[PDB]
Amino acid sequence: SLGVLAAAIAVGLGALGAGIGNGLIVSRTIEGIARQPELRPVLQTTMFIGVALVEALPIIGVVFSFIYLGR
Amino acid sequence: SLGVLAAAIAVGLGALGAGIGNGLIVSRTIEGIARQPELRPVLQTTMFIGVALVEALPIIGVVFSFIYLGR
Amino acid sequence: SLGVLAAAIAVGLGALGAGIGNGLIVSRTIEGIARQPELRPVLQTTMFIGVALVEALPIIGVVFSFIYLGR
Amino acid sequence: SLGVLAAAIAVGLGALGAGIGNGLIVSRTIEGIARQPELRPVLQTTMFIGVALVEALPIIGVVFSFIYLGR
Amino acid sequence: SLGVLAAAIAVGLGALGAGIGNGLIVSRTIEGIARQPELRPVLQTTMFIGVALVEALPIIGVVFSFIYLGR
Amino acid sequence: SLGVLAAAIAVGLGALGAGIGNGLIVSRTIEGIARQPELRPVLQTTMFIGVALVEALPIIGVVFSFIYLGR
Amino acid sequence: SLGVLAAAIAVGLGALGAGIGNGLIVSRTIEGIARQPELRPVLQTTMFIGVALVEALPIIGVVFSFIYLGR
Amino acid sequence: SLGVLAAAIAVGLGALGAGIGNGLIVSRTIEGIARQPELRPVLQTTMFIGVALVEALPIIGVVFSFIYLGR
Amino acid sequence: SLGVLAAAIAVGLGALGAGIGNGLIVSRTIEGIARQPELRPVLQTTMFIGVALVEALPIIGVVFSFIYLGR
Amino acid sequence: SLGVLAAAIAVGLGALGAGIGNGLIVSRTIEGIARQPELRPVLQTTMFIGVALVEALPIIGVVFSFIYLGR
Amino acid sequence: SGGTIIYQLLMFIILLALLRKFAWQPLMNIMKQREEHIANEID
Amino acid sequence: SGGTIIYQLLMFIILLALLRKFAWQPLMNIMKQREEH
Amino acid sequence: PLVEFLGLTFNLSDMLMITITCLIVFIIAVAATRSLQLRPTGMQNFMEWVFDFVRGIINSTMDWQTGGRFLTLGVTLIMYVFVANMLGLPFSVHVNGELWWKSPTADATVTLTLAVMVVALTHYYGFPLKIIEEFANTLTLGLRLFGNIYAGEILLGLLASLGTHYGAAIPMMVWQAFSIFVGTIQAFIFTMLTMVYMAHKVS
């Protein structure tokens, strides 16, 4: 009964956290490449490393949402 | 019963996260193109891939809300 | 029974996300046209494609809240 | 019976998102006014079309809230 | 029934949105007076019409809160 | 009964919104009189009218919470 | 019955709003006395009247929480 | 019988407010000691009294949560 | 029955807090290495140090959520 | 039954507050050691006492979470 | 016998194979850089 | 919980002293010898 | 997956994992420290690199004269926590009993007693608000390492069961590379925060 609501709020708060974190890091890397345009590959590689390290815990939230849906 | 409330709270939190994150990215890239307007294609490709990430985690949030509505 | 409250939280969270996103975008473009005044058309075109780009997922959240209200 | 709660939270979330978005755009458009006076008409025209953008979704929200209260 | 807490959560979210928006715009009027204290009339008149804009949708929300409390 | 929950919620969100708005206006006037201290009385007086303006509506929410506690 | 968590949501939202606003005020007053140290007494006196002005409304929220708990 | 939920939301919201307030104060004071080192003791004392304020409201929140769980 | 969405809000708020903290840290690291490329090894080192510190206390919420699902 | 959810919101809000506070502190000390890299220990010790504060109030929250769990 | 043991151990082995194709070139060059640096510091 | 805490505390003290004596006080001696060299 | 204890007092499987990680750390230490060579190569340069890395961390936190003592505690602490985090990933076997040989750090009692052992050492070498901050940093260090290993252990296990029961190689591959990353980052933050509190109480 409550498992589908549990699953949904878990994946929703994971989406909110990943969206805010990715928005912050991508916005600062595009103002960084707007500040110095010859630093673009280093900035975007560290940005993708940041995408992985802000979406670490929402992705585990997604599979725990599948656990919550299964129960 | 609770499945429609689940699907809608998943879509709502994904929309709020995508809205804040994409607002940060698009806002900083138009102020970056306000600083140096000769960097239009680089800023547009980087904002498009950043928005692709910030949207694409609530995209799988939305399709998980569809399979929540099915249950 | 809960479908109306579901559609309500969906439209409301999509509205809050679109409000914060469009606030960020229009705020930074208004300081951008406050800085370089002759960049107004490029900044407005990128601002409107950003506004549509950030309200893409809230309006599909609204048109999914309609079938949430139905189902 | 919960349609009144549904409509009320729809109006409230629309008001909160519209308040944050209008606060951002009005706040740094008066920053743009305070930095230089001569661009007051173009800053105010972009201001009011930004008010239209950040309030439009909110307006839709309150109309759909009356639809929800009618349900 | 629960229309009383419906009306109250409408009042509360309208108060939160109006508080954040008014705080942002009047704070940056202070920052603009600190940058340049000789445009206080135009800064305060654009401040008060921005206050009207941010306050408008919560006042509409609170009069609908009155129509929500009754039902 | 649940009107106690209504009134408390209105009181709480009014306090949260007034706290964030008053924090923004006072913090930016600290910075404003910190950079140019010879201007201090006029910007602190318009800070106080901004304070009354940002906490006008949470006091209205307090009065409506008395109404809701009475109901 | 539910007056105890009514009292508690009142105290909790008042504490959250007081924490955010007071953190903003104190953070701006220490960066103000950091960038120019000679105005420490002036900035501390206006900081203390600002924090009294912020926490005026959560303290009456706490005494309203007392009369909610008594209900 | 909801006093445990009462005390726990009170402690949780007080912890969230104290965390954000302390984060703002400590972050701006390490930026203050970073831009100039020679008055780190002047910065630290005002930082600790700000931490004392922004936690002294959630400390009385925690004590009131104890008397909530007692009832 | 209630422990499932208990565990779900626990892991969801943990994911939200870790996403915001990771976003702030990583965004400031990449803008700092955008300021100068000569210190990107020490800034990546303290980046991963910071990511561990902000992803540490939400994961104790994750494992405590598993404890909550156990009971 | 509800003590599980009480412990869960307590640890979730404590995790959110500690994540945002630690994120702010370590973010601004990244930019602090990026502006002036010879100030690494004097930034680092103040960073760790700030981490101690912003964790130590959610740490006593999560210590209280187990007695919330038992009841 | 359980099935998870050989399954995740086989994918740990193929993950070490991918990390061998990807990763023996950086860290051996870091160790060679340290060795050549300290050899130039000694000789 | 369990009661392994005194077990691995005493085993960590034993392992620490044993390791240091049998491996790394000689490694620190090699480091100090090449620093003086 | 229950707590399999042959003796009522203490967990048997945790003691087995502590013994196997102590023996593997001791044999890699004596394999890296076989003989004396003034020109470093092979694994002795790796052990000297870890040794100077720990030393660098000590030099970041404190004066070299005060913190020179801690170097041989710190290097065995970082290598011990390093191998203790990476043991849970390859095998994690399930037997017909409750559970056997997962990893030591996934047990909460192991990590909390290792953290309180760290803080007992930095009290040994070295007013209510200070002591509640002390107990706060003990339990947040132990819960830090315990949670950030135990969540990954459960996820890897879940992935293993999803694969075996019914195509899903690359999600657990990406997670397992991220998990050895989490293991080395948690070992480094554990020994670095250890040296931070050591420097805070010594000088």
Author numbering:
A (entry chain c2), B (entry chain c3), C (entry chain c4), D (entry chain c5), E (entry chain c6), F (entry chain c7), ...: 2 to 72
K (entry chain b1): 7 to 49
L (entry chain b2): 7 to 43
M (entry chain a): 6 to 131, 152 to 191, 198 to 234
Give sentences copied directly from the paper behind this entry.
Adenosine triphosphate (ATP) synthases are multi-subunit protein complexes that use an electrochemical proton motive force across a membrane to make the cell’s supply of ATP from adenosine diphosphate (ADP) and inorganic phosphate (Pi). The passage of protons causes rotation of a rotor subcomplex, inducing conformational change in the catalytic F1 region to produce ATP while a peripheral stalk subcomplex holds the F1 region stationary relative to the spinning rotor during catalysis. The F1 region consists of subunits α3β3γδε, while the FO region is usually formed by three subunits with the stoichiometry ab2c9-15.
An improved map of the FO region was obtained by focused refinement of the membrane-embedded region only, excluding the soluble portion of subunit b with particle images from all three classes. Multi-sequence alignment of subunit a from different species indicates that bacterial and chloroplast subunit a contain a larger periplasmic loop between α-helices 3 and 4 than found in the mitochondrial subunit. The location of the loop between α-helices 3 and 4 of the Bacillus PS3 subunit a suggests that it serves a similar structural role, compensating for the lack of subunit f in bacteria. The Bacillus PS3 ATP synthase structure implies a path for proton translocation through the bacterial complex involving two half-channels similar to the paths described for the mitochondrial and chloroplast enzymes. The cytoplasmic half-channel consists of an aqueous cavity at the interface of subunit a and the c-ring (left). The periplasmic half-channel is formed from a cavity between α-helices 1, 3, 4 and 5 of subunit a, and reaches the c-ring via a gap between α-helices 5 and 6 (right). The channels are wide and hydrophilic, suggesting that water molecules could pass freely through each of the channels before accessing the conserved Glu 56 of the c-subunits. During ATP synthesis, protons travel to the middle of the c-ring via the periplasmic half-channel and bind to the Glu 56 residue of a subunit c. Protonation of the remaining nine subunits in the c-ring returns the first glutamate to subunit a, now into the cytoplasmic half-channel, where it releases its proton to the cytoplasm due to interaction with the positively charged Arg 169 of subunit a.
